Amino acid sequence: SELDQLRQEAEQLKNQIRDARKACADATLSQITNNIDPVGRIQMRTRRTLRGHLAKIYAMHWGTDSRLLVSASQDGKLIIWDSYTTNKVHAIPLRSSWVMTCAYAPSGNYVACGGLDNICSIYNLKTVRVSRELAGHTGYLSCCRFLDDNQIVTSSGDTTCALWDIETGQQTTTFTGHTGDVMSLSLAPDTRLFVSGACDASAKLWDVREGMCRQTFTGHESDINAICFFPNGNAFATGSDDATCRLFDLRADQELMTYSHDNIICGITSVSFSKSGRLLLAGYDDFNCNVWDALKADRAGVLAGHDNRVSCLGVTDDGMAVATGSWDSFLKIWN
């Protein structure tokens, strides 16, 4: 059978990949980092409470000025906040309140959001008016991130990601290969690559300009809800339904470390590294953020300031602060 021989060859190739990865696994990260000092207790304070949303917050994204941020809620509003003063700068009424993601363009000129409408809507902050509705996904918009004012990458419950030309409203490139809903994406620092995490329990590394999947990583049969790059672009971390964060190395082409406690069994919604990469912060369904030592795997601290799920988080580009957003309708800024 032609289909049986192709099925057999795919099994041979999966073994070849398994064996090549084993050949590189000469020591573990934990062994390599054994002698570095612990970070010791991380004890951040709530510096700001951002009040104004009237329903669950699903997403947030910092502006590149480390000062303005955008948040999205099932109250049908995107709010742009000045974190330093807590002043609201804009409140944008959404046509669809069923929002799952938002993004701040690096220029500060636009924001984006979408969700169960299957559309990535772009809003012009220097005009506030909807400037584009990007239609083409056939399932929910789970995540979006601008490359520039004319290009945005999206992930979808339709199992694809896409790169869009905002002016034309078309998908330039469709990234196919996941077999389950894609939940999250993260752009490499150099914007050459991005990673996606999906309900097929895999993370995929994609070449933005070439359109292909370069590498696939398995996340142990748990949905990946959140994904983030390590700051040098050579590794990334995932957060999954099974209460576990995982670090993956691109050049060694494998998982290096897990971060979990047996007495935490709830889902992870969100992940981010600190500016140096030493801390991995994750948001949990149990209403807390846990801060992990990325090199040594010990928990370094907690952020406990919410009365419902922590749905989203983000670390400023200047490294100065963490934002948490929550189903309790509040954001908090910590450091």
Partner: protein, 337 residues
């Protein structure tokens, strides 16, 4: 700072707008329609637009034209497939070629109803073999509006065809995103929501619906004689009931009022004359050929599982019936809230 003071006043003006919007949001009631495909959800939404919204103008009707054509092709493609699967013969040799022509239509791209295709459709529909296959539709998936459109193919094929309100009520509007239709009634905003077009993993978005005001669960009464061949001959109505049970036992719907609409009561009245409920549910002890006995049995079965379930029989394509039933349901929902 003048600039700093202006930024504070801008923030306060935004807070005013958010408070106003919050006041309005407290007047909103979310009605989540649930139920398997073909149960009546999209038709119910269209009726709300007819009864309590802007209805359908000439221009609106014109917009639905190509979808009427697509429903026709989809129906005939289903019957062509069933001829092969059930091994039923065409009476007319010409229908071999007609079936191939229709089979190869890309329905998504249909914007016209050209003479070539109209002739093929009519000749297929008039074949006694296709009529025999139509009579065996409980064994496959065919729209309950297929016969309606095919009977009226001449009207639909005429140059200048404008869809009727019934044509609109019956047409499939394809979408794989969320459907929300809000309407005003008595200073309340009803937000009617249908997720049945979504093909993605429900676990990732079901929490978007925590504590909705009301769940309206639609069941086709007419599916009592259909079995799922893949699910150990599970009756389709047993699958609908299992879905219903998952809904009513879901922890974040415990505060939601639950309204069960046993829809397609008109189709039950016809089917019960030839397809016997006792063959599918041998516990049934009522007379044969008796629609009232059958629908009473189906109701008692569906809710044979603390929580109160309200229920009504409906015909979702009958505007007067939906006007009557929803008047009562609105009273219940408002009293509870």
């Amino acid at each position: 700072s003048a600039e700093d003071k202006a930024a504070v006043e801008r923030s306060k003006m935004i807070d005013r707008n958010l408070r106003e919007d919050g006041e309005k949001a407290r007047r909103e009631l979310k009605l989540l329609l649930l139920g398997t495909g073909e149960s009546g959800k999209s038709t119910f939404i269209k009726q709300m637009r007819i009864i309590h919204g802007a209805g359908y103008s000439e221009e609106d009707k014109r917009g639905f034209t190509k979808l009427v054509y697509q429903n026709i092709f989809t129906a005939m493609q289903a019957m062509i497939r069933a001829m092969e699967t059930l091994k039923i013969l065409y009476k007319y040799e010409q229908n071999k070629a007609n079936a191939l022509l229709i089979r190869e239509v890309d329905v998504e791209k249909v914007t016209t109803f050209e003479h070539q295709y109209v002739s093929a459709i009519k000749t297929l529909w008039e074949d006694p073999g296709i009529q025999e296959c139509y009579d065996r539709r409980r064994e496959y998936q065919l729209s309950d509006s297929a016969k309606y459109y095919l009977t009226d193919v001449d009207r639909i094929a005429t140059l200048g065809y404008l869809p009727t309100q019934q044509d609109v009520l019956r047409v499939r509007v394809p979408t794989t995103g969320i459907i929300e239709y809000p309407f005003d009634l008595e200073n309340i905003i009803f937000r009617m929501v249908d997720v049945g077009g979504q093909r993605s993993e429900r676990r990732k978005w079901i929490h978007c619906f925590e504590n909705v005001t009301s769940i309206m669960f639609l069941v086709a009464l007419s599916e009592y004689d259909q079995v799922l061949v893949e699910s150990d001959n599970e009756n389709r109505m047993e699958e609908s009931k299992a879905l219903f049970r998952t809904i009513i036992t879901y922890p974040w719907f415990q505060n939601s009022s639950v309204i069960l609409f046993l829809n397609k009561k008109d189709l039950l009245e016809d089917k019960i004359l030839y397809s016997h409920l006792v063959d599918y549910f041998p516990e049934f002890d009522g007379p044969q050929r008796d629609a009232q006995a059958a629908r009473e049995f189906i109701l008692k079965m569906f809710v044979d599982l603390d929580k109160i379930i309200y229920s009504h029989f409906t015909c979702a394509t009958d505007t007067e019936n939906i006007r009557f039933v929803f008047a009562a349901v609105k009273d219940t929902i408002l009293q509870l809230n």
